[PDB]
């Protein structure tokens, strides 16, 4: 048995908040081109992967999985997690995407790379939805971990993962009842948050398709770890 199911709701939030990965910075001394911007984003994403992997270990219940299962969940959800972090950082910057504290981009700058403007608009749209919903950091760390455990749970060809997923649902509701929402408001806000996860998955898929074309276009040399993450989606 795992040590995650025994944690209280507040003990679940404290574990996720403390495990939160840091906000990294972009390479300094940058207008951008197609190659320079994708170079900055690749280097930033490659460095975030390493923190995410260690953030995943400190996620309650994730270490109790087999090493093969941990690889599968991360391989399928790595871009989703990166995007929901970007959307979270960009929340208090309407119309902009806070990739790094020294790399704030708008929709116009996404046009220097073909197909990036579509995903930019979806990422901005998600960020606007979080802002209008007034998403809290305690709710965000629950949503991110749900993405970790759920995005690859139906592709194992599993009872432990769904037990932890229910534990995070108990935690999410606990956060809403603690903030003062009525019972009807609790399950409505719950549903709205989880429905946005469908679009985050959509954004990851449309983005993954775009990242594989550029590795096939050789626009920027990608790292070995990032290529193993990309190849894991065929």
């Amino acid at each position: 048995n795992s040590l995650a199911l025994s944690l209280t709701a507040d003990q679940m939030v404290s574990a996720l908040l403390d495990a939160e990965p840091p906000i990294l910075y972009s390479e300094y001394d940058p207008p951008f081109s197609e190659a320079s911007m994708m170079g900055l984003l690749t280097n930033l994403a490659d460095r975030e992967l390493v923190h995410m992997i260690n953030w995943a270990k400190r996620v309650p219940g994730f270490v109790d999985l087999t090493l093969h299962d941990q690889v599968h969940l991360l391989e399928c959800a790595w871009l989703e997690i990166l995007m929901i972090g970007l959307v979270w950082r960009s929340m208090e910057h309407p119309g902009k995407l806070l990739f790094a504290p020294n790399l704030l981009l708008d929709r116009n700058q996404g046009k220097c790379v073909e197909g990036m403007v579509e995903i930019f608009d979806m990422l901005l749209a998600t960020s606007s939805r979080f802002r209008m919903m007034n998403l809290q950091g305690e709710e965000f760390v629950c949503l991110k971990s749900i993405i970790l455990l759920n995005s690859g749970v139906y592709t194992f060809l599993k009872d432990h993962i769904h037990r932890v997923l229910d534990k995070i649902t108990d935690t999410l509701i606990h956060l809403m009842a603690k903030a003062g929402l009525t019972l009807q408001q609790q399950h409505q806000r719950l549903a709205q948050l989880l429905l946005i996860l469908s679009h985050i998955r959509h954004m990851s898929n449309k983005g993954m398709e775009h990242l594989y074309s550029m590795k096939c276009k050789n626009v920027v040399p990608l790292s070995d770890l990032l290529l193993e993450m990309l190849d894991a989606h065929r």
Partner: peptide, 10 residues
């Protein structure tokens, strides 16, 4: 084989 294996054990 995979780098993701190494980073998950360290």
């Amino acid at each position: 084989h995979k780098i993701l294996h190494r980073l998950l054990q360290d």
